[PDB]
Write an enzyme that holds these catalytic residues in place. Structure first.
Site, PDB file in Angstrom:
ATOM      1  N   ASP A 164       0.821  -1.248   0.000  1.00 48.20           N
ATOM      2  CA  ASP A 164       0.000   0.000   0.000  1.00 48.20           C
ATOM      3  C   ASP A 164       0.843   1.282   0.000  1.00 48.20           C
ATOM      4  OD1 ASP A 164      -1.821  -2.077   0.410  1.00 48.20           O
ATOM      5  OD2 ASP A 164      -2.081  -1.593   2.540  1.00 48.20           O
ATOM      6  N   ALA A 165       2.138   1.218   0.313  1.00 43.69           N
ATOM      7  CA  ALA A 165       2.906   2.452   0.389  1.00 43.69           C
ATOM      8  C   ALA A 165       2.975   3.119  -0.979  1.00 43.69           C
ATOM      9  CB  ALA A 165       4.311   2.177   0.916  1.00 43.69           C
TER      10      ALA A 165
END
Ligand SMILES: [Zn+2]
Ligand SMILES: [Zn+2]
Lengths: 48, 1102, 67
Positions: free
Chosen positions: B734-735
């Site tokens: 998700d980063a």
């Protein structure tokens, strides 16, 4: 076991109340009213 | 181009929203309250008499809010934004006309103010009603504010819509290994009770009321209600069906087992069990007490010698029990949407004002008795000084209930909390979605997922995506876009209509034939039977479509339970449908042409019988077409527009039908936390917390919903250039990879505004706080604590405040002459800027200082972003522009998102949004990602190809660090990205040592108080599993609470100063370190009569 | 609020094109796409800079407190 004192059954009836130390039941400072606010345990022991 | 009914019937939705807005439940409820319910309360509590002085009375004649008879204009109300700034209540006065008698036979009216009414924003009594954005600018109000909330003491409170089970309706529930119980929570105007109705054993049916001591056999009650043949009892509750006869016959035997019965004998039996009535009217304790027992057993109050209505009610109660006995699945789902009612802010306030006015009347009559108990010189002139004094309690309680959310209703006797919530100001969508939000009834045994699941019956009534996370998943619900909540309609005009239409009253029907033809139920009550129930229902629906009866009255027929049901009560959720007759829709686009041209507003579609409201129950009798192309010659209605099954907040999502549903729910969560534009007066507002995007953009891919709710006017996000690719390894999980120099140019740039409020309060000693100060050093310059403080002692607007500096230099008297300093000090890791200092007074003549601190925020590492599809993440890395991949034109992504977030989440809607937005930017047109619709993917691919791009939005990029062509084509295009309110600057916490709670001598609990992190039971267990005893000791004693206690070796009791103070010797006192928690627990045990004596041995000596 | 000076992705100056875009839309009306192309906004990043801008400063100026 009645080998030691306080082993007598009669010590298990409320006769003396060991009022707790102040640190056990702290009183808050400057709560609502400029006056200090006490707590539930102190109020209960006052009533007792 | 001619109107096409299929793609132009959706204009009914803007037409409907024009006159019936999203925040209209609250508005209609409050308007109805202040227009009629106040009158009803005043007429019910109209005359308070006194036992003394019979030639004297007080009559409440009329009630009015915010208007007197002196002038046609209303009274001047403090504008709501001025109320917000001044921390007061946006309220209008309540006026009554009083007929109080004079001692010399004088009759007179008046216009008396008895308190203040907290006015809902944009209601009939509000100053913002029908304001034209110029009056709104003058009043410092955003024209796009929802309204529908209250400003009490400067705080925006919204009375949330409440779910509850419908009252005065039978609900049958089964059980495993317990038996069958079915209840009727019956609420009259003054008493609520649940006529619980249970089976105990041997298939014996009993009636279990709260007032009755023990559950009464059902035959006893049926005979007590006049139905005493004991063959018609079984005829009424079993009919002709042999199975139910055998199931029910056991409790016919127990009717005679005690003794054979007349009506009056069973009456006396039931009356014997009445509990008490607070020992008033004791001389009713006879067979007469059963009359009140039966008459106050339900909402069917009997005021004559005929008990057939209540008797048949109990009979159908029993019959439902018996069908459930014969088979389960004859019970009704408690989570069915048709079995629930929505109570609104107007109803809440009506009942609360009823209670407050009852208290006011009681105390006023107490004052009247106290005044008139004096023997002589009892002058009457100005008997209203006391009412001038006593009007404050109505205002005070009415404000306190809304402010706190706790509603203490003495008459009805429940204590409910959480009625009101502070309106969310994270975003425009946050406020709008806080409106139209519904809270469900508590005491639900949340351990199960029963009232947590999505029900199919909420289709088009409650949003299928707007549900919260964490703990209230499925409990907090939201209204669908196009819905209506019914109001109460009088049922006696329509019982007469039912009799006109062929319904035979139950007083003309015999028991033997009751289950032969359909019965007709009015709000759950069997009022009669009818032949040809189908024809009766058709006639009723025609009569409602022609406007002869209220369009909110619902009629539907049940085949399993032979019953035609008519509902007129309020609180029912309903939505409009196009009526399909004879295999054709009734709108046929001549009405659509008239609607678009300007004639035929939405209400006229109801008046012409083209549309009608359907509640959840009539949908059982309906057969809806989603579209025109599937109108088969058996369908009753046609969907106006199927995307209205999503709420306002879920309408922000582009192409939600291409996404996995959890992603849509998560975006419903995230959009409320997105940072953007709040209001047109957001810089006039002084709020406790306010995040504002510097450069908000409207989404490239929007929906019909976002333009219906004006989200494109206050958007919360930006259209980031996005390359979907693996990059730098800092984007795993998700980063996100953010572009430096996109941040430099203002991408994701926001600011937070924070208000601090201080009051200079006067004291009983005629002293008050002051804000004097700004002491200088000998060189004339202020000291560092006062660098930005101004001569008045209040920080200067525009000046920066660093941590430790004072911006409010408040001094407090030491005898509240001498003043002790209590200045407001800035405690911030990053400096802020004073952007507003407001000096005012409140309604209670007391100084009020509000300081607005603003703080610009650069998107940094760890700041959270999301993309309208549940794909959230923090900034993993910020990279230079030249390190970014570039296309042939040199376009560089603002954000890089990992392709690994797609395959498992299945947010195909996000890819379609990328392509549609790319086509839209290249074509100059904002595209549509509307649910079940939007811009077709093939048209977007055609636009992309015609402009030289790949049809699928994949471009050949070059590496920014090697310069070579990337071996894969990269998904490259614009995606709307929202910056969420969770910035790492407000989460970074670190404590070495500091504040401790004195009781436990442990570190404090919060990041604000510089608290420590709790090493809980689970972490302790992990450390134990590692086998790290010394780390256990260091974390749980040495670094949390290490107290050096004195322990006597003889008696294991704690001492002080090396003194046993129980043995009084100090010879056996030794010294050791234990947790202060252990010290505290031992001393608390000694407070009770438990002495935990410590036994000590040497560590050494082996 | 007010049109950003530069395109977020490119760094191309777009703050000098907002007014000309508005006058292209109003006076001798053009489609949005051709108005964007006539201003030199060729890349889609610079295109969306102008296409998606919400001129909120005009609404904010309606509440001017120094009248
Ligand atoms: Zn000792
Ligand atoms: Zn650019």
């Amino acid at each position: 076991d009645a080998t030691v004192p306080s082993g007598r059954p009669e010590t298990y009836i409320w006769r003396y109340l060991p009022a707790p130390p102040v640190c056990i039941r702290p009183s808050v400072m400057m709560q609502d009213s400029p006056a200090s606010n006490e707590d539930d345990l102190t109020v209960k022991l006052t009533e007792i | 181009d001619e109107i096409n009914t299929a793609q132009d019937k959706w204009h009914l939705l803007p037409a409907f929203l024009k006159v019936k807005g999203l925040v209209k439940q609250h508005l209609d409820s409050f308007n109805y309250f202040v227009d009629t319910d106040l009158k009803k309360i005043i007429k019910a509590n109209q005359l308070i008499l006194s036992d003394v002085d019979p030639e004297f009375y007080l009559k409440y004649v009329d009630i009015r809010v915010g208007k007197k008879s002196s002038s046609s204009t209303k009274d001047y109300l403090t504008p709501p934004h001025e109320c917000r700034l001044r921390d007061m209540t946006y309220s209008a006065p309540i006026y009554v006309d009083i007929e109080y008698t004079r001692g010399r036979n004088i009759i007179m009216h008046k216009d008396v103010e008895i308190g203040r009414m907290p006015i809902m924003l944009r209601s009939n009594k509000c100053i913002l009603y029908d304001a034209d954005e110029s009056k709104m600018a003058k009043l410092n109000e955003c024209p796009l504010d929802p309204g529908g909330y209250f400003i009490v003491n400067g705080t925006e409170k919204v009375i949330l819509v409440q779910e509850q089970l419908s009252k005065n309706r039978i609900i049958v529930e089964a059980d495993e290994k317990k038996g069958i119980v079915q209840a009727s929570v019956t609420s009259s105007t003054h008493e609520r009770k649940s006529k619980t109705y249970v089976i105990t054993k041997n298939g014996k049916i009993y009636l279990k009321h709260n007032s009755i001591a023990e559950e009464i056999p059902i035959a006893i009650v049926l005979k007590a209600c006049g139905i005493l043949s004991d063959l018609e009892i079984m005829q009424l509750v079993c009919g002709n069906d042999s199975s139910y006869q055998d199931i029910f016959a056991v409790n016919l035997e127990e009717s005679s087992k005690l003794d054979i019965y007349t009506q009056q004998q069973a009456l006396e039996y039931i009356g014997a069990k009445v509990k008490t009535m607070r020992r008033q009217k004791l001389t009713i304790l006879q067979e007469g007490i059963e009359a009140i027992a039966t008459t106050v057993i339900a909402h069917l109050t009997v005021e004559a010698l005929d008990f057939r209505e209540k008797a048949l009610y109990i009979a159908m109660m029993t019959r439902r029990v018996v069908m459930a006995m014969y088979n389960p699945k004859m019970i009704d789902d408690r989570d069915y949407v048709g079995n629930k009612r929505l109570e609104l802010a107007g109803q809440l306030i009506s009942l609360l004002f009823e209670d407050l006015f009852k208290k006011f009347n009681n105390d006023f009559k107490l004052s009247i008795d106290k005044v008139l108990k004096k023997p002589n010189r009892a002058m009457e002139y100005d008997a209203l000084l006391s009412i001038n004094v006593h009007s404050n309690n109505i205002t005070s309680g009415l404000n306190r209930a809304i402010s706190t959310g706790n509603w203490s209703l003495k008459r009805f006797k429940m204590e409910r909390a959480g009625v009101t919530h502070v309106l969310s100001r994270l975003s425009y969508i946050s406020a709008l979605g806080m409106m139209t939000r519904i809270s469900s009834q508590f005491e639900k045994s949340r351990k199960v997922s029963g009232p947590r699941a999505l029900q199919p019956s909420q289709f088009g009534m409650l949003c299928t995506a707007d549900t919260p996370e964490g703990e209230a998943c499925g409990l907090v619900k939201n209204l669908a876009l196009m819905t209506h909540i019914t109001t109460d309609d009088e049922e006696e005009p329509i019982k007469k209509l039912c009799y006109v239409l062929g319904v035979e009253d139950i007083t003309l029907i015999d028991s033997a034939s009751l289950h032969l033809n359909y019965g007709v139920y009015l709000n759950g009550t069997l009022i009669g039977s009818i032949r040809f129930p189908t024809k009766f229902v058709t006639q009723f629906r025609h009569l409602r479509r022609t406007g002869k009866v209220s369009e909110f009255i619902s009629i539907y027929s049940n085949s399993h339970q032979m019953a035609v049901h008519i509902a007129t009560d309020g609180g029912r959720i309903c939505r409009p449908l196009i009526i399909v007759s004879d295999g054709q829709s009734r709108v046929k686009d001549i009405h659509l042409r008239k609607l678009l041209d300007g004639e035929l507003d939405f209400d006229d579609f109801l008046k012409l019988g083209l549309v009608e409201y359907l509640d959840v129950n009539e949908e059982n009798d309906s057969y809806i077409a989603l579209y025109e192309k599937d109108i088969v010659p058996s369908m009753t209605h046609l969907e106006i527009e199927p995307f209205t099954i999503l709420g306002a907040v879920a309408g922000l999502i582009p192409y939600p039908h291409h996404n996995q549903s959890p992603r849509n729910t998560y975006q419903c969560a995230m959009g409320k936390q997105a940072i953007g534009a709040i209001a047109y007066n957001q810089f006039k507002r002084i709020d406790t917390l306010l995040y504002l995007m510097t450069y908000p953009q409207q989404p490239m891919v929007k929906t019909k919903t976002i333009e219906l709710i004006d989200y494109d006017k206050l958007p919360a996000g930006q259209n980031a250039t996005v390359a979907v690719m693996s990059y730098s390894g800092y984007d795993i999980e998700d980063a996100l990879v953010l572009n430096k120099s996109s941040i430099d140019r203002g991408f994701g740039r926001c600011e937070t505004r924070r208000k601090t409020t201080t009051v200079l309060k006067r004291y009983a000693n005629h002293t008050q706080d002051i804000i004097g100060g700004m002491r200088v050093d000998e060189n004339g310059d202020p000291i560092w604590q006062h660098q930005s403080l101004g001569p008045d002692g209040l920080g200067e607007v525009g000046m920066k405040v660093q941590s430790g500096q004072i911006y409010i230099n408040k001094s407090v008297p030491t005898n509240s002459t001498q003043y002790r300093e209590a200045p407001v000090i800035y405690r911030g890791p990053e400096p802020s800027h004073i952007d507003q200092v407001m000096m005012s007074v409140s309604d209670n003549d007391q100084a009020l200082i509000k300081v607005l601190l603003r703080q610009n925020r650069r998107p940094e590492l760890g700041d959270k972003f999301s993309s309208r599809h549940g794909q959230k993440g923090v900034c993993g890395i910020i990279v230079k522009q030249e390190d970014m991949p570039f296309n042939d034109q040199g376009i560089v992504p603002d954000i890089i998102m990992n392709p690994h977030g797609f395959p498992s989440r299945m947010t195909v809607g996000k890819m379609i949004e990328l392509i549609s937005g790319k086509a839209g930017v290249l074509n100059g047109t904002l595209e549509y990602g509307t649910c079940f619709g939007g811009s077709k993917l093939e048209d977007m691919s055609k636009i992309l190809v015609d402009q030289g791009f790949n049809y699928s939005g994949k471009d050949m990029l070059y590496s920014g660090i090697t310069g070579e062509c990337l071996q894969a084509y990269i998904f490259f295009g614009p995606i709307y990205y929202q910056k969420l309110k969770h910035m790492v600057l407000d989460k970074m916490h670190a404590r070495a040592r500091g504040p401790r709670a004195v009781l436990t001598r442990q570190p404090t609990e919060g990041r604000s108080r510089d608290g420590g992190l709790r090493l809980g039971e689970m972490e302790r267990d992990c450390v134990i599993a590692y086998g790290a005893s010394q780390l256990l000791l260091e974390r749980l004693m040495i670094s949390s609470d290490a107290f050096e206690v004195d322990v006597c070796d003889k008696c294991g009791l704690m001492g002080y100063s090396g003194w046993c103070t129980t043995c009084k010797s100090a010879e056996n006192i030794i010294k050791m370190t234990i947790p202060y928690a252990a010290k505290l627990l031992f001393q608390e045990l000694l407070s009770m009569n438990i002495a935990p004596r410590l036994r000590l041995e040497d560590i050494f000596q082996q | 609020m007010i049109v950003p000076v530069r395109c977020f992705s490119c760094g191309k100056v777009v703050g000098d094109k907002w007014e000309s875009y508005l006058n292209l839309l109003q006076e001798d009306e053009l489609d949005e796409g051709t108005a964007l192309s006539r201003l030199g906004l060729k890349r889609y990043c610079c295109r969306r800079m102008i296409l998606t801008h919400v001129d909120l400063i005009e609404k904010f100026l309606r509440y001017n407190p120094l009248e």
